[PDB]
Design a protein around this ligand. Structure first.
Ligand SMILES: [Cl-]
Length: 310
């Protein structure tokens, strides 16, 4: 680590957010939905506001500000940008709204309508997204279908930097605290040595692709977490999904290889899936493919078009 992080954290007035309406509740916290209307600008930006439960127990305010710190330090089409924070009672994360939600829910709730062109394209976009984070020396640690949001069915972005970690020109690993990370998405060296690395994200990427190819299945739906370690140890891996050619499945397996360095690089995955996406019917055999996917507001601009220096 060495280059200075000259990102801008923007504090936003609680009086700039109209039309609030709870999106997802949940144990962890609460995501809202609203309209951010910059102070003296004829623009209304559709936003999600995240206020994670734990009342004010400063323990929270940490996680939420680390989230913010990272989310504010990323500029990529395939990664969610932090719009700003709000210093109300508790802190709030304000970010571009992703109208179609989680990619996980999105595939779950659209199976009989998702073409191969999309699935392969998303894998491209998530690989692009990750490669970016690789460049910004940044280990996501929690890549899952549930952390990819959908802007439009042809444009996804990665999110949830709750466990993300910056590295160093020195550093190559991240020796975690007391683990609180999903087992079914984490590399084998993550589950035994609490080691995290870019190549560990690769594994999670593999599992993510596995989720999409299976339209939302739960990795190891049977097996309980206290057992995951043992299974992978013996050699077992996720099955090959129905719609999946060997070409595509073998990419998934390559991500789950015991020697981390033998795993593909995200820049290879971009290339590989990118090739594949030029002829999607040849790598994915989806029954029915060849599929279509879908007060006043003059002043609405997507965040993606709301810029300002930097
Ligand atoms: Cl679930």
């Amino acid at each position: 680590g060495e280059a200075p992080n000259q990102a801008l954290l923007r504090i936003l007035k609680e009086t700039e957010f109209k039309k609030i309406k709870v999106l997802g509740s949940g144990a962890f916290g609460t995501v809202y939905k609203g309209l951010w209307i910059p102070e003296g600008e004829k623009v209304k930006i559709p936003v999600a506001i995240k206020e994670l439960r734990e009342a004010t127990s400063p323990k929270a305010n940490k996680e939420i500000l680390d989230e913010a710190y990272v989310m504010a330090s990323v500029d990529n089409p395939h990664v969610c940008r932090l719009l700003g924070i709000c210093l109300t009672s508790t802190v709030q994360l304000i970010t571009q709204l992703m109208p179609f939600g989680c990619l996980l829910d999105y595939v779950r709730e659209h199976k009989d309508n998702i073409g191969s062109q999309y699935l392969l394209n998303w894998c491209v976009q998530i690989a692009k997204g990750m490669n970016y984070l690789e460049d910004r020396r940044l280990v996501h640690r929690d890549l899952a279908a549930r952390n990819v949001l959908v802007k439009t069915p042809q444009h996804v972005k990665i999110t949830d930097f709750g466990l993300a970690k910056l590295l160093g020109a020195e550093e190559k690993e991240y020796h975690a605290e007391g683990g609180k990370v999903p087992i079914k998405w984490m590399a084998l060296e993550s589950i035994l040595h609490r080691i995290y690395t870019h190549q560990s994200d690769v594994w999670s990427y593999g599992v993510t692709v596995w989720e999409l190819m299976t339209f939302g299945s739960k990795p190891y739906d049977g097996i309980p977490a206290s057992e995951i370690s043992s299974i992978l140890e013996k050699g077992e891996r996720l099955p090959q999904p129905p719609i999946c050619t060997i070409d595509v499945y073998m990419i998934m397996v390559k991500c789950w290889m015991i020697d981390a360095d033998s795993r593909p690089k995200f820049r290879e995955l971009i290339i590989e899936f990118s090739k594949m996406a030029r002829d999607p019917q040849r790598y994915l055999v989806i029954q029915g493919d060849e599929m279509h996917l879908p007060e006043d507001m003059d002043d609405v601009v997507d965040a993606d078009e709301y810029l300002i220096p930097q």
